[PDB]
């Protein structure tokens, strides 16, 4: 979210 993990874009 950058909080929760996810791809950057």
């Amino acid at each position, epitope marked *: 979210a950058p909080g*929760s*993990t*996810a*791809p*950057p*874009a």
Partner: antibody
Amino acid sequence: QVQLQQSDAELVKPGASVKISCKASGYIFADHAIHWVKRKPEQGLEWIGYISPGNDDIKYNEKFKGKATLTADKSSSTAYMQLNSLTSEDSAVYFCKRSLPGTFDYWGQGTTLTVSS
Amino acid sequence: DIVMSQSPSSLAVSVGEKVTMSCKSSQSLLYSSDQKNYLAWYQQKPGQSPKLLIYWASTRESGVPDRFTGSGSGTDFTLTISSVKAEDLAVYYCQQCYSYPFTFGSGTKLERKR
């Protein structure tokens, strides 16, 4: 310790639905998203979508929106993928796997689906 | 959708020698905020689950032998096995982790030269 235990092989007729399970143990289920991946002979690997049971976030590959449904039962630490209107194109090995590529990457043993009349 | 391309489709390798495998992305996988390439390499052997070898293009996953090395940046990536062993004869897939939908290359299968 960590395991993702998938349900047994499925053999079904064209047009049927199937629901595959992926039971997590050895860690806290809500801590990691479960992604689903299709391994079909001569079609490498394909990402289907994920369910994040901690925040109930679900995302699909556009190709599978309308075809696949991802659910999760927090009480039994189990993720589910349902596939509908099955064709021989759906015959494949389906894997559940934990998290993103990185330190938490971990895979189930796979479930074979055969669709045939 | 990011298109991942791998060549060659298969490769006859001499056991004990170095092998290099290529992967190309249709879009840059380099994220300017953290300077990381969101590219992973997986191994798969028949009847087994995929195993993560490399992520962030060059970070070796836990329990992966040192003969495996990832390099490259942007759109052009390489997986190297120094001194390939018989147990390394398998299919190698790159995967971009940069944006949804996650997409994989079509794989490079390593077979043994004789």
